[PDB]
Design a protein around this ligand. Structure first.
Ligand SMILES: Nc1ccn(-c2cc(O)c(COP(=O)(O)O)o2)c(=O)n1
Ligand SMILES: Nc1ccn(-c2cc(O)c(COP(=O)(O)O)o2)c(=O)n1
Lengths: 433, 428
């Protein structure tokens, strides 16, 4: 009944990954994803490969398609490199075995082949093979960290904590993520401190409130409205940190504009890193990743001063633009859901930010297809919400849909949108009564 | 100053070329202090401009290495950036039609900045600037990074100046860079005793020092004794003004030929604050084949810096043991010796005085040579670059600078030695 026993089973695999890296002297290709979790894993792998005297070539892909894998296969012909896949690989393992890659797969997504040792050439470190839920108990950067600690590089756990936040696995903190955080505390690489979300930004509080999207508070979402609210309740809006009296006064007033004020409180992680707040670094890597600035994201993980300066500039441009995108949403209410039409890459992010009491579905039309992205919260699921079954009703409209209880998608022909949404609305009202 | 405006034409074009490239990028540097510093300048510059890259560190840019690299142009043609190499191999790079940028301070084969619309070559000799005295390969990389405003990278340029022994005297473009790093507050200069850079006990700092090498003090015990006799606590780690005066007078008296005990220290903005120490640290890890660790030291990683300190002192001890057992053999106008792969260059440098020194080691069926001279020797017509080139007469290859060059041959060590002593008689 111990995390210790499960680690001993995982450590058989990480030992083999370690020996495999040390004894390789050819080229090394690292392939990672572009979100916070992937850029974190990239930085963990980068530091770890350098410390073990391994030069490497890092590439970032949004999706590991058949085309990308075949394009990669054309590098095996001349100098067959060792490939390390982070946050990807397990679902595409068939195509990786087909081309006979020399490969290490570090993936928390559900696996296709539940084996750690695939043949003589491919090692797969996936927590699902050990009975650990990769959607709640570990992230991709956690998986790389498990490898990194085989070399005793505990200082890299701070990048794992970043990925834990990036993937929204910090509340509640479960399984291996809890083990990682506690190890980082034991080795003095993180300090944990309950605090208000607005103090993570180290800027003027009225700007931290104005552009916050976790939670998004519409009535406070502008410098002017935020300044006014802070002046009225006796707080200097130019301060960059709220003390204990400030936070009481703030929370006391704000509960009228935004009643679920437990969302305003977090456990802050202060990390051994130039960007000392892990929540801020998580948001920075996200913004940088969304703007295509992958290499700058790696530099941030590597603590370079000018990448950090870029990242700080891109973060605030990104946060301002997101608030504007949010103010422009035409939110339509049905009986048990909200819905809106938005842009292709935003509807998922925006729907999640807009949830409060009811689920939110955003959709965009492309050609004659409408693609939907639906979001809830833990309070809704506990009242019997399940989005995967409600998005599955798309098959009745000549489409299909599924996902998780709290997040799901679906596709439908452009002209059945109104009738799909009315059907989804009724299913959800069923799931609540 | 006037020459910067002429160089700035090529640096601008290099900038636009890198910016507008969106495929793969290959960076090829050398393993000495200068090439590793170049690796660090290009690594940070490329990240800051949003370029992923594949860095490789090679010991010789041979015909064979070039041919292996060119098979990467068949599928997805990368932009190649060559640092501290490529100018003498320019003929083979054109042959294979690399999309390339050559950042090299070795004497050029072709004397053009813009080769064939596909190659840019930034060589200081093109502009009448001496790649042996006035600029290093780091400084060439720094001249590009300037174009982006990455002035903080000047500290790695200073590390290359020291590593390529161009700090005393400080000339030309190196002087521009140093002053630029001082104006932007990235370096502080302070005159001090050489032994104060190591931040270890003084008797160890003396025992293992090789600039200057003092054979009678090159031992923990003899150094411990020498300091106790003259009234200095040998367990101290920094010498104050009074101990500096007492150590100087004692060393200079017993060894009046000695020099370079007082140096201008460069305190850089870097986790390894002393650039002289950083220069030695990078040299040590390079000679041990720890290329990625050297990059990591430039990128200021704590664990890499930890390795570099351990390796550095292992290296300085082995070096002292090698110097006490060297079999210097005189020919007509050179000395020569056999040694270990990672020492023959540095030992040649330390021993050189009155005549050029060539060291070599055997690896497989090949012998690799390393020839060194002084500025005093180069002023009298010494040119190791031409003299080592004679290795093509023995089915080989050789080149470098006037003052420091290398070569490879097979079973013709004594013969090619003689043929080079011949070329160095004529030169003198
Ligand atoms: N037929 C489908 C379509 C989508 N999904 C899915 C997975 C996932 O994580 C989400 C939520 O994210 P998105 O769909 O991108 O809003 O949806 C599914 O399971 N079955
Ligand atoms: N065919 C060659 C071999 C060596 N070099 C070279 C560059 C450099 O800085 C030194 C110093 O000498 P070594 O440390 O012996 O390589 O040599 C060259 O340019 N062409």
């Amino acid at each position: 009944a111990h995390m210790m026993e499960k680690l001993k089973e995982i450590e058989k695999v990480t030992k083999a990954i370690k020996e495999k890296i040390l004894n390789h002297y050819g080229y090394i290709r690292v392939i990672t994803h572009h979100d916070t979790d992937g850029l974190s894993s990239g930085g963990i792998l980068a530091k770890m490969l350098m410390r073990t005297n391994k030069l490497f070539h890092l590439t970032v892909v949004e999706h590991l398609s058949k085309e990308v894998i075949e394009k990669l296969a054309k590098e095996n012909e001349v100098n067959k490199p060792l490939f390390i896949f982070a946050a990807m690989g397990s679902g595409q393992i068939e195509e990786i075995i087909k081309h006979n890659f020399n490969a290490i797969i570090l993936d928390h997504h559900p696996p296709v082949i539940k084996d750690s040792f695939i043949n003589e050439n491919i090692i797969q470190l996936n927590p699902h093979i050990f009975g650990v839920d990769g959607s709640r108990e570990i992230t991709a950067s956690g998986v790389c960290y498990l490898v990194a600690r085989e070399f005793g590089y505990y200082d890299l756990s701070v990048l794992a904590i970043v990925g834990i936040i990036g993937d929204m696995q910090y509340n509640p903190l479960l399984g291996l993520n809890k083990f990682i955080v506690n190890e980082a505390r034991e080795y003095r690489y993180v300090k944990i401190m309950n605090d208000i979300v607005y103090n993570i930004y180290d800027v003027e509080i009225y700007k931290a409130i104005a552009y916050c999207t976790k939670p998004y508070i519409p009535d406070l979402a502008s410098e002017g409205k935020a300044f006014k609210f802070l002046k009225d309740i006796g707080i200097d809006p130019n301060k960059k940190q709220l003390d204990d009296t400030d936070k009481k006064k703030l929370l006391s007033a704000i509960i009228f504009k935004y009643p679920k004020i437990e969302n305003l409180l977090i456990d802050r992680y202060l990390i051994e890193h130039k960007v000392r707040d892990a929540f801020l670094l998580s948001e920075m890597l996200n913004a940088v990743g969304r703007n295509g600035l992958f290499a700058v994201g790696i530099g941030i993980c590597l603590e370079d001063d000018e990448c950090i300066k870029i990242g700080n500039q891109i973060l605030w441009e990104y946060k301002k633009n997101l608030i504007n995108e949010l103010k422009s949403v035409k939110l339509k209410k049905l009986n048990n859901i909200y819905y809106f039409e938005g842009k292709k890459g935003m509807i998922g992010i925006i729907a999640s930010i807009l949830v409060d009491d009811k689920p939110v579905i955003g959709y965009h039309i492309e050609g004659d297809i409408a693609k939907f992205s639906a979001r809830g919260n833990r309070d809704l699921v506990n009242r019997g919400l399940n989005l995967s079954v409600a998005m599955a009703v798309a098959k009745e409209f000549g489409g299909n849909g599924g996902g998780h209880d709290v997040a799901s998608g679906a596709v439908v022909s452009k002209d059945k949108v109104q009738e799909f949404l009315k059907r989804v609305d009724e299913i959800i009202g069923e799931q609540l009564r």
